Amino acid sequence: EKRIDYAKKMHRDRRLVEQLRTHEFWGWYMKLQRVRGRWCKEHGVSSRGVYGPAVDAAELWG
Amino acid sequence: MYCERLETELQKAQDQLPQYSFMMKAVPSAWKKLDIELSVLRGLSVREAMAQCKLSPRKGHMAVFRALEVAQQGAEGKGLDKEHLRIAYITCMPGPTDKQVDIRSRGYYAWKTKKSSHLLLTLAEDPEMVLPDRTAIPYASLMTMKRA
Amino acid sequence: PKRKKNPMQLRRKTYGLHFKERYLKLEEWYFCPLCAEPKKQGEWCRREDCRQIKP
Amino acid sequence: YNSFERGWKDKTVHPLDRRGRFNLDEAAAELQLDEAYVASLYKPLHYTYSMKGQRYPAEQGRTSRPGSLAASRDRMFPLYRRNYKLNRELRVLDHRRISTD
Amino acid sequence: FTYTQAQMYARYRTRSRFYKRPEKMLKAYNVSPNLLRLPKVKPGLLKGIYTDEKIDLRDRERLELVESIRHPKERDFYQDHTYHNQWI
Amino acid sequence: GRPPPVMGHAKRMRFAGVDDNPSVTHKPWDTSEPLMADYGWERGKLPKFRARSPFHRQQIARRMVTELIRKDYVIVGGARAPALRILADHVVELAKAGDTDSRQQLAYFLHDPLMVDKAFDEYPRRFRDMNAKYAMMTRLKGRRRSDNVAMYFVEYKNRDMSDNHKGEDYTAGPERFFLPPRIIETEKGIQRPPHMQMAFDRWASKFKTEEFHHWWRLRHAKLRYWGVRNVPHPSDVDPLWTEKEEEEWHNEMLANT
Ligand SMILES: [Zn+2]
């Protein structure tokens, strides 16, 4: 009953920090898509193929 | 006084030659393998031998090429030419062979012997050897280029 | 193997065009004008000049 | 393998797990979990607590060689020294907790 | 072999020799029989094996050169220990 | 005669014509399909390089594509190269199309999401005018030391029209593998897209610690337990990245200062 409390404690906080790594990786990844979101407007790279948006506006495949 | 006259004469009768003998030992390869990859080199200019070696991915050609950069590095000290130098005799010499225990299946053992050889190399000097120009793609210079 | 082989048996091994073409053939080469190193044709270096225009 | 010649190198060390750089003790301070303990979670439990484990022999460090001084297993691998305070505090039963008389 | 359509004698010191290597003549009572007649000139000069450099790859100098040669696939084990307890 | 001379099924060979004949079986003899798991020596199949399983081969098709996109060159070996260049002409056939069908049909295929975030931005700009053969398969000369597998250098075509690899140099690999690649001095005045070079050092950040410098020290013990010739002892493997190599880079981020 001390090495049960020991095991349940090494797992209880292996997620508590796994609840930071992935929790904060996402929080940071959205900085990336934001800084990519800002940069991809001034440089105008629509990131949607070789065509202009006139192929998008049809809302077909093309 | 008689054997001091030999050991000075035989020495002076050997260094005044246009040869350079150089032995690399414990070239870590058996004799069957290492040696058959020498008989391609026996009788080649060192500028060619140092070429045919650096290309082939074999081990025998990389061991001798280790010499043909050290031997000629020592040959040029003896006065021997760097260019006109040949490979007179490049022979393999059976050498030390360890004995390693091997453990075959079903309680049988058979001693693997990690083999090693010795490499005897005699760079000689050919006086009139014309080093052929090697700067044209082997023979793409023709039969692939159109006539005229 | 129900017999050991004399050299004339081991020596036939070295006549077919399988031994010769595998071991005893010199490779055709030339000097890479950019690297000054010996080289075979159809092969190049990991280097901008050697990689843009094939030496 | 961007090597062109594989080896004990140019074997791309982590071609996954791109979320590197974890500041454990810094993150362990947010969780209030005994910074010395949290870092132990992230290495094989052999290395920190008094557990049966398998060590590589080079890891053990060699005697004083003619080429190199005696390289103890610690001074080359500091963060692998077992912490026997952290073991005892967690894993073994103290005389105190069962003292009855 | 070799032979460029030319009868070079053969393969030199290679094909035949590698068949039955000569047994090594042992010394009786550590004696060398004809020692008291042959000169003392170093044997590098007697039969003719006179080599300017006998480079020796069994050396701690050339350990880097040996490890330069052997194939990466030529794994060698027991680098940091030995199976037999050396402390006996 | 009236039935085909060789009935429904028989494997001809490598190097054999289609010899079309009336048959029930289906043969493509064409491979215009993008990012396809059709590995084989036939015509409608890209060359099946060797691997443990058509799954594990697909796993090799992932980490060798996501590493060609990540850094525009991958020194790939043997029958992977003719099998990769057709996957570099497909990624651009996936990056050009653009529709959110494709951007996933590559998202399913790449181990990492930032790549599918890159491939769709640079490649429409880069290859807007090239319509095929996007990967250049230049063969390196020295066959691998570990086996006689050949080594081709598959690189994407024009990078002077790129945005991420504008003027980089690939004559030699990065010194420590977490260090950004040497740049052509004639165009030293280039800055990068931030989302590319701010997520890189996010990744390269884990090797600049000491826990990896312990995993580096340690690994050299494994390779000796597994005895690998020419592996320095973990006692003289002084770190890759260090404090002296810290001072330059924090002062090389003068942009955010
Ligand atoms: Zn070159």
Side-chain angles (χ1 to χ4, degrees), chain C residues 5 9 19 24 32 34 39 41 47 49-50:
Chain C
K5 310 156 95 170
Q9 285 259 353
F19 192 113
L24 323 172
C32 182
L34 318 175
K39 184 177 76 67
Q41 174 200 5
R47 175 160 151 271
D49 308 66
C50 274

Side-chain angles (χ1 to χ4, degrees), chain D residues 61-96:
Chain D
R62 66 199 165 286
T63 188
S64 43
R65 261 206 64 202
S68 74
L69 280 164
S72 43
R73 65 168 189 85
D74 303 347
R75 280 190 310 272
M76 60 165 84
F77 294 103
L79 317 173
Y80 291 168
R81 307 175 298 205
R82 295 176 159 173
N83 191 353
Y84 287 125
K85 276 91 79 172
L86 258 292
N87 158 283
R88 161 185 285 112
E89 295 263 330
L90 269 64
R91 264 181 44 77
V92 74
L93 170 84
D94 202 52
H95 348 289
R96 264 59 182 147

Side-chain angles (χ1 to χ4, degrees), chain A residues 2 9-10 13 17 21, chain D residues 19 33 37 41-42 92:
Chain A
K2 193 166 182 193
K9 204 210 167 206
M10 269 189 323
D13 45 40
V17 285
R21 290 177 300 179
Chain D
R19 45 92 179 160
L33 299 166
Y37 154 91
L41 270 184
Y42 283 127
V92 74

Side-chain angles (χ1 to χ4, degrees), chain B residues 23-29 31 93-98 114-119, chain E residues 54-67 69:
Chain B
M23 195 175 85
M24 185 190 328
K25 324 155 65 178
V27 282
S29 159
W31 320 287
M93 202 159 181
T97 82
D98 187 288
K114 286 270 166 173
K115 289 186 172 179
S116 153
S117 155
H118 294 164
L119 187 65
Chain E
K54 292 168 80 84
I55 195 170
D56 188 350
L57 302 196
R58 291 169 298 195
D59 196 37
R60 294 290 152 201
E61 268 204 78
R62 267 56 183 252
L63 70 86
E64 54 85 18
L65 194 151
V66 161
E67 298 145 46
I69 293 177

